[PDB]
């Protein structure tokens, strides 16, 4: 029984060594069937080294310890066959058929533990980079649009001029180019939030919201930029059409104000004419002007229809600003009151022209009645002088027959005295009216005056000469 | 002596009647030789009626009274010839020869009294109308130019914009047309003062001055209007050339600010590449950008040379106004400090690109040394397994000759254990560097792991199988 005790200390070796690796195989099987991922990537990096130490340090001894127990069994069962001893049966379930099933399930548990950790850290690696690139991109574009909505809402242009509105439009033009450059920024952030949605980020709850808030603001900026452009282009086209009317207003306001201011001097301009044609020519030129009054009144209405159009523009489009012309110093009141003064002066000029026409007619009436008498008295005296000249020489030697004719001529002259007095009145009236230019007659009052003064001097002369010749002859 | 007393009462009649008309002829001769004109026209109008009453009322009796005394003489001297009485000789100088000389000088005094009064009132009439037309014209044009000189002096445009200066120029354009319409007004007043100078107005002393003052102001207005136009056209052409530079500034400021603001994101943009070509392609595109830095720096200098030109314009022409751009929100400081930030980020991007290139090179260095061992250990184990497979079947029936080869293969495997441990280190290092993509080899650590684990399991198996076959054969 010396060899009988050797087998007892070798069969308990297989029983103790089987429990040594079965207690290890039963403690690592729940760990190998874990497959529950961790949140951080660093945790899975350690979990791969935990599997690595198992694969290069704890599995190599157990691989050898699997067939080592099989080595001891395929020798111990040959020892109890040579000296034909009772065969060994292991306790509870520490048998060869049983241990093979534990390693068959352990090698079935790790049929993808390395491949699970690798493609979990492969996914985790992309999630960790995309998470920080999202925070980077969504903050640089978050901060860009701080205040962008409120500035787009500004209604400053409601009281701006065509200069400030065009300048505003060029500033707004530049912001549109600035906006365009960020389309690819929000396009990128939308795709980063989609890749972080597909890869299942732990905080994709707040990324779906933080990205939709940014993408929703972008929709607001697109429309707001076109709505402010719609208001700036409308304000630009309202002040542009107001300037077209303010330039066209000033264009015809000055020529008309110069014509009106000029016509006021000419309507009052004093004059003095001594010819009936001299006054007529003034009426000829004044009645020519009287004809260009509906012609210029039509122009006056047209010029006012242009400043009434600018008040209509501000009213219809409700863009309450100063309807004053910054080009012309000619007001609508000036064109109303100045015109009334010009129309008021026309009957004054007509009245003063016709009163001078009446004067020239009265002056010519006096010239005509003076010439009728002068061209009858003048030649009557020249013929009465020639009658006396012929009657004062030779004839019948009888003085008494020439004394009859001399006292007859004397009576002819007495009867004509009244007709001379007529001319003195009409002469006084011509010079009282301030006329001295008589074209119808050649004789002046003085030429008749001397003819009559000669006529009476030479009748009494030749009468006294015949009276002395009658006495100095007895 | 009854007829002797009749001649005494008839000779004293001629002596008394001669003194009656000689006292009249001597009182009217100084009046007839007056010819001293009066100031007013109304005074000469009366002076003509004074001559008229003399010509139609006081000369007609004296004409008859001249020859009436001659009638009495040429009868009285025939009476003292019939009854031969002493001839009559008039006292002092009341003789026939003497009275003829008084009337010869009286008719010589009035040889132009009517013609002097007529052409004095003819001249006076024009002087009286021209005097009131001068006062009318010189007051309407005096009042027109009240303040015209001071307004022309206004230096308001020194702080006006291109809008206000063009508008000012259109207002000034209108005043030039207003000025032109009054050239014929001052031309007329100059001719009225010349006609009042030729006709000798009593107050032509003050008309020569009052007209030269008005004509002197006109000379001032002509030059002043062209001097203010010279200043308005200069201000218009200075602000016009400043706007050409402010539009050209904004034109290239936004594209450059968008490029600069865009390049700042791309210089910091994070990335992760796992290929040596993946990193190379980034350096390819970054070094392309590094080449368009003198290209855009030249553009940056050109854009700044345009805002330095507007400061040069205000300085050279001394028209101190705001040199700020009302078109672009891009300041010169923005273009200086933003550029410095872009140049500061280039070595950061170069540093971070090259550090990742070093990583990719180190990762490929590890891939290459792992594949060199795997593509040598893998095929060595597959050839050691095939050697044992051939050595474990048939051969010499002697087990001891196969037991020699089995324990020889065993030594070959022991000597190779270190070479396997090498791969475990380099495998750990590849996954420690986060690499899993090895293209050079087909085998992973696990494929070598199972080959070695099979190799030791099947050496001890076939060794124990030969050991049982040596014992169960005696």
């Amino acid at each position: 029984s010396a060899v009988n005790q050797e087998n007892e200390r070798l069969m308990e070796e297989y029983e103790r060594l089987a429990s040594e690796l079965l207690e290890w195989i039963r403690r690592t099987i729940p760990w190998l069937e874990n497959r529950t991922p961790e949140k951080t990537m660093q945790a899975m990096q350690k979990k791969l080294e935990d599997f690595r130490d198992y694969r290069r340090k704890h599995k190599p001894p157990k691989v050898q310890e699997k067939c080592q127990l099989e080595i001891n069994f395929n020798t111990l069962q040959t020892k109890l066959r040579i000296s034909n001893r009772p065969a060994f049966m292991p306790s509870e379930g520490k048998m060869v058929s049983d241990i093979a099933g534990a390693w068959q399930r352990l090698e079935q548990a790790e049929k993808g533990y390395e491949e699970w950790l690798l493609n979990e850290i492969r996914r985790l690696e992309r999630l960790e980079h995309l998470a920080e690139k999202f925070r980077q991109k969504a903050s640089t574009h978050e901060t860009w649009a701080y205040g962008k909505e409120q500035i787009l809402l500004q209604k400053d242009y409601e009281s701006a001029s065509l200069t400030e509105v065009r300048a505003l439009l060029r500033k707004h033009e530049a912001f549109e180019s600035d906006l365009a450059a960020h389309q690819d920024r929000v396009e990128q952030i939308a795709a980063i939030a989609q890749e972080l949605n597909e890869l299942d980020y732990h905080d994709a709850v707040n990324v779906n919201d933080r990205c939709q808030k940014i993408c929703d603001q972008w929709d607001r900026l697109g429309t707001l930029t076109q709505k402010r452009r719609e208001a700036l282009e409308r304000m630009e086209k309202l002040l542009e059409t107001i300037d077209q009317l303010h330039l066209e207003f000033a264009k015809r306001a000055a020529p008309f104000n110069n014509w009106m201011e000029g016509a006021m001097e000419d309507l009052q301009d004093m004059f003095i004419v001594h010819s009936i044609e001299e006054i007529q020519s003034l009426i000829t030129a004044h009645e020519q002007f009287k004809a260009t009054l509906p012609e210029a009144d039509g122009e006056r209405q047209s010029i006012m229809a242009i400043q009434n159009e600018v008040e209509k523009v501000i009213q219809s489009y409700n863009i309450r600003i100063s309807s004053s012309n910054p080009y012309s110093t000619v007001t609508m009141d000036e064109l109303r009151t100045k015109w009334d003064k010009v129309k008021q002066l026309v009957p004054i000029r007509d009245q003063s022209l016709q009163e001078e026409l009446a004067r020239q007619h009265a002056n010519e009436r006096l010239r005509r009645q003076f010439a009728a008498q002068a061209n009858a008295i003048g030649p009557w005296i020249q013929n009465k002088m020639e009658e006396i000249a012929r009657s004062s020489i030779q004839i019948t030697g009888a003085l008494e027959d020439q004394m009859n004719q001399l006292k007859q001529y004397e009576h002819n002259i007495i009867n004509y005295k009244n007709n001379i007095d007529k001319l003195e009145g009409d002469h006084q009236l011509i010079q009282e009216a301030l006329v001295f230019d008589n074209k119808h007659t050649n004789y002046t009052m003085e030429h008749i005056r001397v003819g009559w003064e000669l006529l009476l001097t030479t009748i009494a002369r030749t009468i006294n000469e015949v009276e002395t010749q009658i006495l100095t002859r007895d | 002596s009854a007829v002797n007393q009749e001649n005494e009462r008839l000779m004293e009649e001629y002596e008394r009647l001669a003194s009656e008309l000689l006292e009249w002829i001597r009182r009217t001769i100084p009046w007839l030789e007056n010819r001293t004109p009066e100031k007013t026209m109304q005074a000469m109008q009366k002076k003509l009626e004074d001559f008229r009453d003399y010509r139609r009322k006081h000369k007609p009796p004296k004409v008859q009274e001249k020859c009436q005394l001659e009638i009495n003489f040429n009868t009285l001297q025939t009476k003292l010839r019939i009854s031969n009485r002493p001839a009559f000789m008039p006292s002092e100088g009341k003789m026939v020869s003497d009275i003829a000389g008084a009337w010869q000088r009286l008719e010589q005094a009035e040889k132009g009294y009517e013609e002097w009064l007529l052409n004095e009132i003819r001249r006076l009439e024009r002087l009286e109308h021209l005097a009131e037309k001068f006062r009318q014209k010189a007051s309407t044009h005096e009042t027109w130019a009240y303040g015209k000189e001071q307004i022309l002096l206004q230096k308001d445009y020194e702080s006006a914009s291109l809008t206000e200066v063009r508008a000012l120029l259109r207002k000034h354009e209108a005043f030039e047309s207003d000025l032109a319409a009054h050239q014929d007004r001052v031309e007329q007043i100059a001719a009225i003062a010349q006609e009042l100078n030729e006709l000798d107005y009593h107050d032509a002393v003050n008309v020569n001055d009052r007209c030269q003052k008005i004509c002197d102001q006109w000379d001032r207005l002509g030059t002043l209007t062209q001097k203010r136009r010279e200043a308005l056209e200069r201000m218009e052409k200075l602000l016009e050339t400043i706007d050409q530079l402010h539009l050209e500034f904004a034109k290239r400021a936004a594209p450059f600010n968008n490029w600069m603001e865009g390049a700042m994101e791309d210089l910091q943009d994070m990335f992760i590449v796992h290929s040596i070509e993946e990193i190379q392609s980034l350096i390819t595109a970054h070094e392309q950008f590094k080449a368009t830095l003198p290209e855009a720096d030249g553009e940056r200098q050109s854009i700044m040379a345009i805002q330095n030109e507007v400061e040069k314009v205000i300085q050279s022409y001394n028209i101190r106004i705001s040199s700020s751009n009302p078109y672009s929100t891009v300041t010169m400081d923005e273009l200086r400090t933003k550029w410095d930030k872009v140049k500061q980020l280039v070595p950061i991007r170069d540093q971070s690109l090259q550090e990742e290139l070093a990583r990719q090179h180190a990762n490929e260095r590890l891939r290459r040394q792992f594949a060199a061992q795997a593509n040598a250990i893998g095929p060595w184990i597959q050839n050691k397994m095939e050697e044992i497979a051939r050595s474990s079947i048939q051969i010499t029936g002697a087990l001891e000759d196969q037991m020699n080869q089995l324990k020889q293969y065993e030594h070959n495997i022991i000597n190779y254990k270190n070479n396997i441990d090498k791969l475990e280190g380099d495998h750990q290092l590849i996954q420690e560097a986060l690499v899993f993509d090895n293209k050079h080899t087909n085998y992973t650590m696990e494929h070598i792991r199972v080959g070695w684990e099979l190799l030791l399991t099947t050496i001890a198996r076939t060794i124990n199988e030969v050991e049982t076959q040596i014992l169960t054969r005696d």
């Binding site: 016509a263 000419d266 003034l282 002007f289 009054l293 122009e299 | 024009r126 037309k133 007329q188 001719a191």
Partner: peptide
């Protein structure tokens, strides 16, 4: 004698 008398300019 010269004429200084003016007439309004028709439009």
């Amino acid at each position: 004698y010269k004429s200084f008398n003016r007439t309004a300019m028709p439009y």
